[PDB]
């Protein structure tokens, strides 16, 4: 549900799309995530290990 479950009813949203909103808050456009989704995912799975 992203971050909308703390201010009312929880609304679902695909995870690959939710992160595109978090980038949009940083200051980078969302097109940098979709064009690098595979690289970013491989860069996040390794980090948690």
């Amino acid at each position: 549900s992203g971050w909308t479950f703390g201010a009312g009813a929880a609304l679902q949203i695909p995870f690959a799309m939710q992160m595109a909103y978090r980038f949009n808050g940083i200051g980078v456009t969302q097109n940098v995530l979709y064009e690098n989704q595979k690289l970013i995912a491989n860069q996040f799975n390794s980090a948690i290990g």
């Binding site: 690959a16 979709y34 064009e35 989704q37």
Partner: protein
């Protein structure tokens, strides 16, 4: 490269601004081409 993209069409805001103008130009063109 974008995973899961879908198919549709995007309407140019100028498209009605030219479909009613270039055709208007075309209608003006038709106003002199036929005779």
């Amino acid at each position: 490269v974008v995973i899961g993209i879908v198919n549709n069409t995007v309407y140019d805001p100028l498209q009605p601004e030219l479909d009613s103008f270039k055709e208007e130009l075309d209608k003006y063109f038709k106003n002199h081409t036929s005779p």
